[PDB]
Each structure stands twice: as structure tokens, then as C-alpha cells.
């Protein structure tokens, strides 16, 4: 299967594993990818950006059904925007992402998170599939869904997804007025987390002649409240954030007989962001910043096979990213990537190379940097599925439009960072006997070097945070994972999984002690747990399915200074769920009962943004 043969470090959750990982809005399931440090905010509908291996959170690229989405305004992408109702396959690639048949924007990013949309099967007869997954509970959370699927002409299929997601989200978090132990404590309710998400999707799959002409039309309107940080003695926020993201996406694939595969990608993305703060003390009575984004994306990637085992890829891209506000930037980008000697050989080298070059015409930088990537999957010992893997990858951040064109707080001369990665790993899998149908363990020691890091440093006056290239973070962590399914007796799967990360991410920007950043030399960076880990346990019985999932994160620090005054404590998030399917005259009903944060721990991952406590979520679903 997958996750073993991949040269780059791949982790995959299928539909049954994401079923076992009880979560919504994707980012609660991203936390189990064994290297991911998530930067999160409050609960449902918060900003939930992702860092791949404690790199920058803008070094990730999340791809919605074959094309990466690109947030330009504060390029840390909102992962909680995507919901888990229609996700067939979730996958994290730390590198080249195995095969070289991708659009060019998938390359030159230090890690990609691939969300795959449910591809309909259409079993015999049955033109029409109807699915609803009404989820409710957890302080006013409501979520109806519709999944109208329809076959048209035996090669055309249409999927219309709808998701209303009104919410209240008042969490009974526990606020501590300090950091030490002898502190008076309060039971305060979270305010202004009213999320009113709405997602619409019309996807057309055209299995022509192999040929695919997959299309998607996505709409997303939201009216989420943006809660403030829990400042002491004062919690009254009225910040509203309206998003109106939409895109029309096209994905043509053609197999031009032997030694030729061709692909076209197209995308028109329009985004709207209205940030209202009526409690702000601007003399016109509150900020009403509106941001308009547009992305024209094109790709004409081709793959040519020299032999049956060796291949090359030439992937040309194109992007016009325009922005308007309330100056008014426009970025023209051109990526082309030549994938090198990719060999898929049996018990010898599975080596692969990739050189991608980029060209941006923006009043800003005009970079033409070349980015190499080498991934080898050498495999001795033919009798067992044991892989040695090694990939070197040099990626780089682009400075976001908030980093360049925010109202004279962001710099214009930002150097566009670096991400230099040398992961080496051992991947083992076996299916010995029938007591253990599947066993797998994968350990990757990796060394990430970030140079010229774009960081927001405060200035303690008006236009508070300012962009500066002051950071040279060196990451030297090791990430292990395991998946062990054992079946005692019969039909009683005790499917287990686990993950662990010894993350050593030291800021080494300036070695001398006589410097403001010399106190940060050889010190852990701000939001990065050292001993982050996770685990899951699925109990598959025919009368009731059970699932458990726990998150451990070690002593997260703050600001990189590493004193006990700005320590964040280690947390454990334990969760349980139950699943049941009913067959009612060929209609599949599904009952789901999820308890999230089972041990009622009021924990925070970013300071003064407390995560929800024990929540109960009830899902009733109708299939066909």
C-alpha cells in the first residue's frame, strides 16, 4: 500500500481513519500528522494555521482536490475553512510528494497538505445518491449537510454539496490570572465566537474515453466572530470577520498512449474579507477593512516516460494574484519544474530529482530563485518491506501581501526566507499472521534549516507589528509513527495508531551574548512543543464501533526567551467516539456520538486563546 513506498515522507488518513479521528474543520485532524505544529486560536471557526515540521506556517501548501489554494492576505492559510464532511483522503507530504505528476505550485513548498474530495462510486443502477450528515451539539453547534450525487451520461457525474454551519461556541474555559501555581482562578465564558459558515460545491467528474476533466465550483460565505485574547479583567469583544471565498476549478488529464501523459489545471479564485471592529477607537466609529483577492491559476504539466520504470516531468505554471483593499498590489508568478531522474526500481534505488524555478513580477522583489529537491528510497532486504529514505529539499517563503502592503507597518524589502531540509528515515511494514493484519513503523530524523526568516516584531507604538528578516531557526527533530491493527478472535478489529515527535527547534540567529537576539541563541522558538505526540485506538465491533484519540504536547514556550515566567504547560487532549450504521430498506443511517476533550482540561496552545473543554457532538446521517 501507500505511506511506505513514498520517497518523500507521506502520511495518509483514509475515510475510515478520519472516521476514527473524530473532528470537524480538518485542523483537529491535522494535529495527528506526527510532525505538525499547529498554531491555533479559539475553538470552532478559529484561525488554525499549520507548520509542517516546526517551519514557518506559511511554508505549507494546502491543496483542495488537486490544486493548491493560495491565501495571499496573511499567507498562513485558514485550515479550519475546509470541513471534514466531504473529505475522502487527507494526506501530508513533507517533500516532493512521491510521484512527480503534480502541478508546479505543489513543488517549491516545504510541505503540502492534500485534502481530497469524495469521488462518487456509482454502483450498479442507482442514478442518484442522497446523503445528509446533520451534526449538532457542543454549545449551539448545528451543521446540516446535503450531498446530491447524480450520474448524467455514464461518463459524467455531478456532486452538489451544501453545508450550513451556524454555531454559538461559548466555552466554559478556566482563566488563570498569571503563570505560577498560587494564583486565583476564574470560570469565565468565551464571548463572540458566533460562526455562521456556509459551503456550496458543484463538482463534475468527466471520465472521458484514460481521460479525466474534473471540475469544481466552490462557494464559502461566513460571518464568524473573531474573539479577542483573554485579557485579564476585560473580555468584551465585537470583532466580526466575513469571508466570501469562491473558486471555479478545472482539472484535465489525458493519457496520450505510451510515453506521454498530459495535464491542465485551471482555477479562478475570488476572496472577500471584511473585518469589522466597532469597539475600536477610530474616530469614524470602528474599522471596516475590506480585502478583495483574485487568483487566475493555470498549469500545463506533462510527463514523459523514457522506459517502463523511469520518468521525467515538465510542469509549467502561471498565476495572476490581484488584491484590492479599503496599495492595490498585483503579483504575476510563473513556475516551471523539471523533475529529474525518477526511477521506480524493485529492490534498488528509487531516486528522484526536481529543479523548480519561479519568476515573479510584482514595486517589489523580482526573484528567479532555483530550488532543488532530491528524494531517494533505497530498499535492501527484499524479504521484508523495509525502506531507507532520504530527501533534501530547499524551499522558500514568499512574503505575503500583509507582509509587504499593510499600512506602512510591513517592510517592502523582505528577503524571501529559506527552508533547507535533510530528512532521513526508516520505514517498516509487515502483515505477519492473521492476529496482526497490518503493522507499520516509520522513524524520520530530520534537519531543517531556516535562514532569513520573516518575523513580526513589535515596535510598541502605532502600527505595532513590523516585518523584519531576523531569524535563523535550526530544527533538528525526529518524528516517529506507527500503525498496528490487531484482530483477536473474529470481527473485533482493535486498530491502533500512534505518533511521536522529539522536536528540537533552536533559534541560532546570532551567537554573541551582547545582542538583543543573543539571549535567544540556542533557545527554543516560540510555539513549538518538544515532545509532541499523538495516538489513536479504533475498536471495530459489528454492534458498536468505538474510537479514541489523544494528543500530547510538551512544554510549549513563548517568545523564544525560555524563562519559566512565559511557560505554557504540557497538555493532553483525550477524546472518544462511538459509531453505528443501520440498514433500513437499503438506506444507510449513521449515528455518531463524540466526546471531545474527555478529560476536562482547559488548555491553551497560543497564549490567552483557550481551547474548548468537554464537548458532546451528535451526528445523524442518511445515505441513499
Amino acid at each position: 500500500t501507500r505511506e511506505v513506498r513514498s520517497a518523500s515522507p507521506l502520511q495518509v488518513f483514509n475515510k475510515e481513519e478520519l472516521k476514527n479521528l473524530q473532528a470537524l474543520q480538518v485542523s483537529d485532524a491535522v494535529k495527528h500528522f506526527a510532525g505538525v505544529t499547529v498554531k491555533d486560536y479559539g475553538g470552532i471557526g478559529g484561525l488554525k494555521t499549520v507548520s509542517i515540521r516546526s517551519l514557518g506556517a506559511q511554508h505549507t501548501a494546502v491543496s483542495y482536490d488537486g490544486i493548491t489554494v493560495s491565501d495571499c492576505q496573511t499567507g498562513q492559510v485558514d485550515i479550519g475553512r475546509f470541513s471534514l464532511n466531504n473529505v475522502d483522503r487527507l494526506s501530508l507530504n513533507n517533500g516532493q510528494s512521491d510521484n512527480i505528476f503534480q502541478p508546479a505550485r505543489f513543488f517549491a513548498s516545504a510541505g503540502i497538505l492534500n485534502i481530497q474530495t469524495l469521488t462518487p462510486h456509482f454502483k450498479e443502477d442507482k442514478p442518484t445518491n442522497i446523503a445528509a450528515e446533520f451534526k449538532t451539539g457542543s454549545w449551539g453547534l448545528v451543521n446540516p449537510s446535503l450531498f446530491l450525487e447524480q450520474q448524467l451520461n455514464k461518463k459524467w457525474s455531478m456532486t452538489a454539496n451544501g453545508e450550513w454551519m451556524s454555531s454559538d461556541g461559548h466555552y466554559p474555559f478556566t482563566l488563570r490570572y498569571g503563570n505560577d501555581a498560587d494564583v486565583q482562578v476564574s470560570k469565565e465564558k468565551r464571548r463572540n465566537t458566533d460562526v455562521e459558515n456556509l459551503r456550496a460545491e458543484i463538482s463534475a467528474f468527466a471520465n472521458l474515453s484514460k481521460e479525466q476533466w474534473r471540475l469544481k465550483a466552490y462557494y464559502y460565505q461566513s460571518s464568524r466572530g473573531l474573539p479577542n485574547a483573554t485579557t485579564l479583567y476585560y473580555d468584551f469583544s465585537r470583532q466580526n470577520l466575513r469571508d466570501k471565498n469562491t473558486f471555479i476549478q478545472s482539472q484535465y488529464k489525458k493519457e496520450f498512449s505510451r510515453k506521454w501523459v498530459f495535464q491542465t489545471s485551471a482555477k479562478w479564485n475570488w476572496s472577500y474579507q471584511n473585518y469589522q471592529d466597532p469597539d475600536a477607537l477610530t474616530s469614524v466609529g470602528g474599522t471596516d477593512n475590506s480585502y478583495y483577492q483574485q487568483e487566475y491559476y493555470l498549469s500545463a504539466s506533462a510527463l514523459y516516460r523514457i522506459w517502463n520504470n523511469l520518468s521525467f516531468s515538465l510542469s509549467t505554471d502561471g498565476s495572476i494574484n490581484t488584491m484590492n483593499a479599503n496599495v492595490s498590489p498585483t503579483r504575476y508568478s510563473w513556475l516551471t519544474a523539471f523533475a529529474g531522474k525518477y526511477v521506480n526500481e524493485w529492490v534498488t534505488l528509487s531516486a528522484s530529482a526536481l529543479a523548480t524555478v519561479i519568476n515573479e513580477k510584482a514595486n517589489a522583489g523580482n526573484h528567479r530563485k532555483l530550488s532543488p529537491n532530491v528524494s531517494i528510497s533505497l530498499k535492501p532486504f527484499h524479504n521484508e518491506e523495509l525502506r531507507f529514505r532520504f530527501f533534501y529539499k530547499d524551499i522558500f517563503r514568499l512574503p505575503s501581501f500583509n507582509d509587504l502592503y499593510y499600512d506602512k507597518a510591513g517592510n517592502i524589502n523582505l528577503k524571501p526566507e529559506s527552508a533547507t531540509q535533510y530528512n532521513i528515515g526508516i520505514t517498516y511494514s509487515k502483515a505477519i499472521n492473521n492476529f496482526i493484519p497490518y503493522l507499520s513503523a516509520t522513524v524520520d530524523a530530520y534537519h531543517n534549516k531556516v535562514t532569513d526568516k520573516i518575523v513580526a516584531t513589535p515596535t510598541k507604538n502605532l502600527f505595532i507589528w513590523s516585518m523584519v528578516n531576523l531569524g535563523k531557526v535550526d530544527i533538528k527533530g525526529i518524528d516517529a509513527t506507527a500503525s498496528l491493527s490487531l484482530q483477536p478472535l473474529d470481527k473485533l478489529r482493535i486498530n491502533l495508531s500512534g505518533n511521536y515527535t522529539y522536536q528540537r527547534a533552536l533559534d541560532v540567529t546570532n551567537s554573541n551574548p551582547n545582542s538583543p537576539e543573543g539571549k535567544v541563541y540556542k533557545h527554543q522558538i516560540a510555539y513549538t512543543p518538544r515532545v509532541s505526540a499523538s495516538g489513536q485506538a479504533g475498536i471495530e465491533t459489528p454492534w458498536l464501533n468505538l474510537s479514541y484519540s489523544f494528543l500530547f504536547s510538551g512544554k510549549r514556550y513563548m517568545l523564544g526567551q525560555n524563562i519559566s515566567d512565559n511557560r505554557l504547560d504540557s497538555y493532553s487532549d483525550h477524546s472518544i467516539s462511538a459509531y453505528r450504521d443501520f440498514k433500513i430498506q437499503k438506506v444507510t443511517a449513521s449515528l455518531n456520538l463524540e466526546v471531545l476533550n474527555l478529560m476536562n482540561r482547559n488548555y491553551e496552545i497560543v497564549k490567552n486563546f483557550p481551547m474548548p473543554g468537554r464537548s458532546v457532538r451528535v451526528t445523524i446521517g442518511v445515505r441513499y
Binding site: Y177, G178, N179, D180, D182, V183, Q184, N228, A229, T230, T231, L232, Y233, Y234, F236, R238, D279, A280, L281, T282, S283, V284, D407, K408, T457, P458, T459, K460, N461, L462, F463, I464, S466, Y502, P513, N514, P516, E517, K519, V520, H523, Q524, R530, V531, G554, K555, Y557, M558, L559, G560, Q561, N562, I563, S564, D565, N566, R567, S570, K607, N608
Partner: protein, 626 residues
């Protein structure tokens, strides 16, 4: 395996001698970061020598809030204006416990975001980014009246019975621009009486002497470096003088102001000394000892010791410093890692948690006749306007009781001090110590712990007649320079009162030398000549030492003689102590005395330096070891 641990601060807490004249407690307010609510209020107790970084959280078992902006001590209470948390902590002074929580909130639940506090006739007036000034009683601690002063306000001050509030309008930079107004509020009716067009974005505002208000005005863009300092006459409430020198903030004593500028493009920081009367800069660098400064966050002035407290914030991410400088710019000490972005340092003398007692720190000055100098006719010379010589003597005793520094002026000016009890003679080791305000430079031209040495000859005498009067025979102490060619015995100098009151003071000696002690722009009193002296010409008699100050430019170093002189060395770390066994008579013979009572100190060096004036022996407080 969690090997991640809190790595220590490595550097020590204090990197200098922590001495201060008459200051009991010193409170440092630290902002922390925005939306991170790790603000703090640290203290240093000079009496107990105790440093407490988390004093508010150690007392009330709860954090201070988010971005605590201002602190002020008034009427045995400490008022802390906390911005993002929108609170005013009004904590009690002797206990340190919070007594009442004032909610700086509007009609709805929206925060007013208050910034600064000013006091006038037991009412606390607090300005906000809401554009409001609130009056709070010091007894009931309730918001009595709210006035609207227009756009966003940053700092508030009291002068001539009127509140001056700097309407910054800072948050409107992306819209209608920053405001350009300072509002004037009366006490009696408490309405906005006048609005002064001052210049764009007025920030820190402070009253001064000669009945005036000094306010710093920024640019329309803060990074543009269009800073100015505006002197506003409080009689007419109009802009009087606009100084074009770049200021972020400033601290005022007398006619002079210590002000720092800090650009944001090149990150260049400078701290200058400025004359508020002449309108010109005096020293383009305030730190004249080579101490590196990177990010001064704010500058304060000790109201009753004269020192200058500049806080360090660095990258606004690591814990800052608090650096104490003297008037001359030499570093006294620095508190390291005292808090996250230390904003405001305030001072007190009443402490928290007896003249009849001996207390080993002397009792009362008997004779005080100083030579003319730069410190004469000021508060450090025990003189105020219109008081006679006996009033100067009893103020000298009062300043000696409160451990305040007393100056001696130029050459020959002498002071005579006694104790509660006679100091017994300790054979083989030292007997008494004289505390001095001299500080050491870390690097000089030569060794021997150089810095600002102002040597003075000490004399001792025994109260044999027991009348408590300085009529006994005086014995000079043989110092390290005694008996050599480096000293000039039988030196008689005389000073003439200048015919202008504000003139340079002329001195002539019996060695054929004629000269002046010069006026400098730091000390701008009526005369450098002592005003309680009724005679035109005064004379002094004593030994002249060799001049120890060497011109290295603007970085004059007083090189220290080894031993045997007052204010010759810093007051700790040896060679500042004295024993009875060094005393010799007029003929130079050694005299052994079983006890001692009377200590006389006069300045040994007749030398002009320049911007630090003449060599002046400053006596802190004499103290015995028994």
C-alpha cells in the same frame, strides 16, 4: 524524554552598586506584550536590598493585566493605569494589597483603554484612547466625572491648576490623520477650556519649572522623524517655543531635560541633554562613559536623588533592563531582566513592611562653609531662596539625616561633622568610612580603578573640652600624597562675588595664579557664589593637591589617588575607609588618639574641568564601623 527546561538568565541581576540617596522603594512597571497579558510590576527595596520581579502577582495572587501603561505613587497609594485590560489598580502602599478595582469602561462593555494618570488636589485624572478624561476620588475610588477631549489621548499632566491632555489621535493614521491638539481642563468647573494647536501626534507631556508645560509632538508619520518639543506657557495656554530637536520622551529637572530620540528605519537611538531655557542641546550623548545603549524604552528622573533612570526593551521580546545614571552620565548600576518591556520607573521614600537612635550614621553638621561651585545655591547645597546661614546649617543636618548628598563647591570649602558617640580607636585596621558619589569607569587611560575622582583632605579632632563645639585643635590625616612634591602646602585662595549675579566667579591665590570657575548650562541658579555669605570676598586656607583630571576630549577622567582622601574612590571595595592612625599634627609628627569625635572635610583640588565644572567634593554620609 522531555529535556526541554527553562534555561536561566545567566547574567546577574545587578551589574553595579545599588546605592541611592533617600530613596526607599523603586517600582518598575513593565508592559509585557499586546494580547499576551504578561505585564508586571517589579520593585527594588534599597533598605532591605531586595529585588522582587513579580511583586503585584506575589501580593494579590493575580496578574496585573495587559499592557500596563502608567504608574504613579500618590498619597500612600500606587495607581497603575493598565491599557488593554482597561483597569486602574489603586494598590495600598504599606501592605501592597490591591484595595479596589476601577473599571475604565464606557456605557456599553467597550473598553476606554486608559493610558496615563495625573493628580491635583486629591483627584486622579485619567486620559484614554476613548478621548475621555475621568476624575477619580482618592477616598471612594469611584469615577465621578467624564469629559470628552476629542480624539485619542496619550498622556496627561498638571500645571497651574489645569490638566493638559495630549490629544494624539494616533489610531486615525489610516484615516483622517493624527490629531494636533493639547486640551486644557480647569479644576473648578472641569470642562474643556482651551484647545492648543501644538503639532501632529502629541505624546508624552510633563510640567516643568518656570510655570510651563513641555510636550513632545511626533510627525504625521512616526517613522518620518518629524519630532519636536513644544514649550507651552501656562499663563496664556498657547504655544510659546517649538524646539526642532528630535524627541521621543524626556525627563526634566531645573532648567534642563534629558531626552531620547529613536528612529525606526536605521534603529539609531540617542540620548541628549537639552537646555529648556537656552533652547540648545548641551551634550549630544548623555551616556558619557562608553556604556552601550540599544533600545531606550522610556526615560525617568528621580525627583529626590537626581539620578536618571533609562529602561531598556531591546527587541521588545526579551526582558529589559533598568539603567541608573548620574547627572554626569556615568552608569551607577543596572537591574537586569527586571521585566518584559519595562515602561515606567517611580520612586518613594516612605518604604513598605529615628533621630534619637545613633544608627551609626552621624547626627548633625556643625560648620558648613563651601567654596563657590556648580552645586552651590541649589537643593544639594542645603540652600533655598531667602534663608539665612543657620537655616542652611539645619537644612544640612536634615539632608545628612535623610542620607542626601551635600556638596562643598570649589577648593577650600569645608564641612565639619560629629556623631552621637565617640568613635574608639581601632589599632591595625580602619576606624570610619566616608561615603562618596564617585563611580568607576570600566576602562580608563591608566589603572587604579579610574573614573570621577574628586579628592578632599580630611581632618580629625577630639572633643577634649566636651562642649560639642568645633574649637579644638585640628589634625590633618597623612594621605598617600602627603609629604611629597605632588601636594602644595600653605595654599591660600580667595573668591570674589561677581558684579553680575549670573557671572563667572573669580578666584585669586597667593601662588600667583588667577582664574575663574565657569558657568555651565546645567546649573542655572541665581549665582554660583553662596547667597547666605554677606561679605564680598571670601578666603580659604589649606593644602592644594595636584590636579588629577586629564583631558581626553569630552571624556574627562578623574584619576584616583590610592588612599587617604575623601571622595577619592567609590564608596565600596576598599581604599575609601579611614583610620585614626594616619593623623599627623602641623609639624608632621604622629599623634595617637584614644577616641575621636570631629571630622572635617575640605576639597583638595583646584581645577576646572569644563561641562562638569570644578572639582567638587561631595559628602554622602560619614559612618563609623562601631
Amino acid at each position: 524524554c522531555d529535556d526541554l527546561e527553562d534555561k536561566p538568565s545567566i547574567v546577574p541581576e545587578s551589574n553595579g552598586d545599588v546605592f541611592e540617596t533617600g530613596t526607599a522603594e523603586m517600582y518598575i512597571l513593565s508592559e509585557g506584550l499586546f494580547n499576551q497579558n504578561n505585564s508586571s510590576l517589579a520593585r527594588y527595596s534599597f533598605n532591605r536590598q531586595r529585588c522582587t520581579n513579580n511583586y503585584f502577582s506575589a501580593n494579590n495572587q493575580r496578574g496585573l493585566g495587559d499592557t500596563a501603561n502608567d504608574i504613579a505613587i500618590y498619597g500612600n497609594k500606587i495607581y497603575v493605569v493598565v491599557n488593554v485590560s482597561s483597569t486602574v489598580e489603586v494598590i495600598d502602599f504599606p501592605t501592597g494589597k490591591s484595595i479596589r478595582q476601577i473599571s475604565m469602561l464606557r456605557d456599553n462593555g467597550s473598553s476606554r483603554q486608559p493610558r496615563a494618570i495625573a493628580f491635583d488636589k486629591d483627584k486622579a485624572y485619567i486620559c484614554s484612547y476613548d478621548g475621555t478624561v475621568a476624575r477619580i476620588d482618592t477616598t471612594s475610588l469611584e469615577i465621578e466625572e467624564i469629559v470628552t477631549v476629542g480624539r485619542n489621548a496619550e498622556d496627561i499632566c498638571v500645571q497651574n491648576g489645569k490638566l493638559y491632555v495630549s490629544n494624539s489621535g494616533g489610531l486615525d493614521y489610516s484615516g483622517p490623520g493624527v490629531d494636533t491638539t493639547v486640551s486644557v481642563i480647569d479644576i473648578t468647573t472641569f470642562k474643556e477650556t482651551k484647545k492648543i494647536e501644538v503639532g501632529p501626534n502629541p505624546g508624552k507631556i510633563l510640567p516643568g519649572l518656570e510655570e510651563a508645560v513641555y510636550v513632545v509632538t511626533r510627525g504625521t508619520d512616526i517613522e518620518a522623524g518629524d519630532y519636536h518639543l513644544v514649550k507651552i506657557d501656562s499663563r496664556t495656554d498657547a504655544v510659546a517655543i517649538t524646539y526642532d530637536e528630535k524627541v521621543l520622551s524626556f525627563a526634566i529637572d531645573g532648567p534642563i531635560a534629558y531626552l531620547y530620540t529613536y528612529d525606526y528605519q536605521t534603529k539609531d537611538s540617542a540620548i541628549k541633554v537639552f537646555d529648556l531655557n537656552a533652547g540648545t542641546v548641551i551634550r549630544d550623548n548623555f551616556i558619557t562613559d562608553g556604556t552601550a545603549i540599544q533600545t531606550p524604552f522610556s526615560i525617568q528622573l528621580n525627583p529626590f536623588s537626581g539620578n536618571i533612570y533609562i529602561t531598556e526593551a531591546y527587541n521588545y521580546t526579551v526582558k529589559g533592563d533598568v539603567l541608573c545614571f548620574n547627572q554626569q552620565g556615568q552608569l551607577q548600576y543596572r537591574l537586569n531582566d527586571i521585566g518584559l518591556n519595562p515602561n515606567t520607573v517611580v520612586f518613594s521614600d516612605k518604604a513598605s513592611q529615628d533621630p534619637n537612635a545613633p544608627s551609626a550614621f552621624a547626627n548633625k553638621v556643625f560648620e558648613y562653609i563651601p567654596a563657590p561651585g556648580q552645586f552651590i545655591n541649589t537643593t544639594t547645597s542645603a540652600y533655598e531662596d531667602g534663608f539665612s546661614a543657620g537655616q542652611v546649617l539645619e537644612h544640612a543636618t536634615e539632608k545628612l539625616k535623610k542620607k542626601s548628598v551635600i556638596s562643598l563647591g570649589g577648593f577650600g570649602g569645608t564641612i565639619t561633622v560629629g556623631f552621637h558617640q565617640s568613635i574608639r580607636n581601632s589599632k591595625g585596621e580602619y576606624d570610619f568610612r566616608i561615603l562618596g558619589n564617585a563611580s568607576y569607569n570600566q576602562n580608563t587611560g591608566t589603572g587604579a580603578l579610574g573614573g570621577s575622582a574628586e579628592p578632599g583632605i580630611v581632618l580629625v579632632s577630639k572633643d577634649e573640652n566636651g562642649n560639642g563645639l568645633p574649637d579644638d585643635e585640628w589634625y590633618e590625616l597623612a594621605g598617600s600624597e602627603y609629604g611629597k612634591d605632588t601636594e602644595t602646602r600653605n595654599y591660600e585662595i580667595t573668591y570674589y562675588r561677581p558684579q553680575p549675579a549670573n557671572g563667572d566667579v573669580r578666584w585669586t591665590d597667593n601662588q600667583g595664579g588667577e582664574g575663574f570657575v565657569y558657568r555651565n548650562s546645567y546649573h542655572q541658579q541665581d549665582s554660583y557664589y553662596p547667597n547666605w555669605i554677606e561679605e564680598d570676598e571670601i578666603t580659604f586656607r589649606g593644602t592644594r593637591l595636584k590636579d588629577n583630571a586629564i583631558n581626553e576630549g569630552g571624556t574627562w577622567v578623574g584619576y584616583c589617588y590610592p588612599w587617604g582622601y575623601a571622595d577619592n574612590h567609590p564608596n565600596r571595595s576598599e581604599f575609601s575607609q579611614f583610620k585614626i592612625d594616619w593623623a599627623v599634627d602641623q609639624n608632621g609628627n604622629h599623634v595617637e588618639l584614644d577616641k575621636i569625635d570631629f571630622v572635617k572635610i575640605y576639597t583638595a583640588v583646584n581645577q576646572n574641568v569644563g561641562w562638569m565644572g570644578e572639582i567638587s567634593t561631595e559628602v554622602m554620609t560619614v559612618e563609623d564601623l562601631h
